[PDB]
Amino acid sequence: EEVLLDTTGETSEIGWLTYPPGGWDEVSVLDDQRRLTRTFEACHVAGAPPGTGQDNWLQTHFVERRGAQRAHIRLHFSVRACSSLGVSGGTCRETFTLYYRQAEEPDSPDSVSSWHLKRWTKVDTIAADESGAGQRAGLQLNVKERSFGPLTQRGFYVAFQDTGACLALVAVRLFSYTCPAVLRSFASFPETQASGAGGASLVAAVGTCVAHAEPEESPPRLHCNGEGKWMVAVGGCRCQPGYQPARGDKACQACPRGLYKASAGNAPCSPCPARSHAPNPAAPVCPCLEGFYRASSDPPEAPCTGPPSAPQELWFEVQGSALMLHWRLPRELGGRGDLLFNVVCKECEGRQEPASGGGGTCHRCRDEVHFDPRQRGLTESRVLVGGLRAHVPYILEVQAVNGVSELSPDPPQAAAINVSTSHEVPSAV
Ligand SMILES: *[C@@H]1O[C@H](CO)[C@@H](O[C@@H]2O[C@H](CO)[C@@H](O)[C@H](O)[C@H]2NC(C)=O)[C@H](O)[C@H]1NC(C)=O
Numbered sequence: 037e038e039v040l041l042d043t044t045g046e047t048s049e050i051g052w053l054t055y056p057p058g059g060w061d062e063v064s065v066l067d068d069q070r071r072l073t074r075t076f077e078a079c080h081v082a083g084a085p086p087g088t089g090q091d092n093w094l095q096t097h098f099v100e101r102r103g104a105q106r107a108h109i110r111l112h113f114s115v116r117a118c119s120s121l122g123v124s125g126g127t128c129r130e131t132f133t134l135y136y137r138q139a140e141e142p143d144s145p146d147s148v149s150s151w152h153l154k155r156w157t158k159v160d161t162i163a164a165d166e167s168g169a170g171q172r173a174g175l176q177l178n179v180k181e182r183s184f185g186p187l188t189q190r191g192f193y194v195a196f197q198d199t200g201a202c203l204a205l206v207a208v209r210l211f212s213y214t215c216p217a218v219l220r221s222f223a224s225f226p227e228t229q230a231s232g233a234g235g236a237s238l239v240a241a242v243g244t245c246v247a248h249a250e251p252e253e254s255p256p257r258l259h260c261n262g263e264g265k266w267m268v269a270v271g272g273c274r275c276q277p278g279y280q281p282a283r284g285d286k287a288c289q290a291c292p293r294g295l296y297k298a299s300a301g302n303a304p305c306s307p308c309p310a311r312s313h314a315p316n317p318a319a320p321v322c323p324c325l326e327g328f329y330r331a332s333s334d335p336p337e338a339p340c341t342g343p344p345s346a347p348q349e350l351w352f353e354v355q356g357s358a359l360m361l362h363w364r365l366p367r368e369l370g371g372r373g374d375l376l377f378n379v380v381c382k383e384c385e386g387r388q389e390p391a392s393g394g395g396g397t398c399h400r401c402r403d404e405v406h407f408d409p410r411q412r413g414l415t416e417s418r419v420l421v422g423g424l425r426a427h428v429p430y431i432l433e434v435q436a437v438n439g440v441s442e443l444s445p446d447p448p449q450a451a452a453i454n455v456s457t458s459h460e461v462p463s464a465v
Pocket of ligand 1: 393394396
């Protein structure tokens with residue numbers, strides 16, 4: 037609610053006039069509580085019995101329009117009943133009508149400002165809610181309200197017409213309704229004017245995302261009712277990663293330490309998954325502790341995991357022209373079950389005439405040893421080893437790996453076993 041003219045303020049703020057001189061009369065009184073009150077009266081009806089007709093106007097000072105598009109007016113007034121006056125069959129009324137006119141400049145100093153020939157626009161005729169003049173303080177004081185269609189010039193005048201009533205204007209209040217600036221739906225909306233055209237019409241208002249918000253792909257919008265309230269919205273922003281709603285649809289606050297928020301929007305932060313920390317606020321993800329990782333496939337809400345330890349309990353057995361390597365699971369799997377194994381083969385030479393200080397050649401196997409499923413990428417703790425030579429001594433190493441350890445190797449954890457093919461000379465004691 038934004039005031040453009042109030043009679044109960046700074047004593048009246050009055051420069052008004054009356055078209056037929058003496059048509060309206062300013063009479064000042066004391067109101068129910070203590071206060072000087074400028075009021076205007078028109079009761080010519082008690083004059084000549086023909087009346088000779090009544091057309092007595094009362095015009096305001098130029099009202100600046102400030103930004104209002106739709107002016108509301110609130111009148112307080114007494115009206116004397118026609119039954120309670122001299123014999124005034126016909127000529128007496130109990131109503132007055134109400135007008136406005138627009139101007140972009142106050143009325144033309146002294147050289148046009150006898151108005152009344154200017155095009156006045158009618159607003160409505162007003163009547164009292166019944167059951168000279170003068171407010172007695174018996175709450176004969178009627179209150180009525182009306183409003184004027186769109187205001188576009190710099191200001192306006194308002195005029196009052198008495199055509200046979202015994203009237204006492206007591207108070208006038210000219211205002212417009214405004215919608216307050218507000219935080220709604222994670223956005224800010226400005227103070228917004230304007231019914232404009234009248235009661236049903238709305239005025240559309242654009243919002244900006246508050247601290248740490250984004251649109252909801254939708255860029256926000258909110259609508260200003262003709263009485264200053266905010267009718268229903270479209271769109272709205274959402275909070276940002278690392279930020280959660282706070283004070284309710286109204287702001288976004290950073291996650292506290294040890295919490296995070298991966299993603300989109302109006303959703304509270306959640307505490308860090310296993311083996312991660314959020315050392316600081318506004319965390320979008322909790323990084324893993326030293327020695328732990330998250331795989332390609334791991335979302336930020338996954339716990340962090342680690343690479344495996346070495347395979348255990350290597351052993352083997354011969355089956356025809358080939359040899360089967362066996363082992364068991366690592367004692368530490370890092371909290372993931374995408375464990376798979378890799379086997380390396382080495383043919384080792386060694387202790388003969390030269391190189392008596394660790395003299396094993398230990399090259400890798402030839403291209404004629406094909407391991408039965410794969411040699412690399414095994415999910416099972418076994419492999420069949422193909423074409424390895426008769427007395428040549430081999431060494432078979434088994435590496436463990438899982439879905440991290442792309443992420444840091446240190447070299448993969450491993451185990452190996454000395455292996456020699458054939459056996460002879462039965463036991464004699
Ligand atoms: C596989 O066999 C080799 C050779 O027989 C083993 O080698 C030696 O290990 C001892 C201590 O255990 C060292 O003192 C020697 O110097 C090593 N030899 C050489 C040539 O360096 C080896 O330990 C065995 N490893 C497995 C896993 O079976």
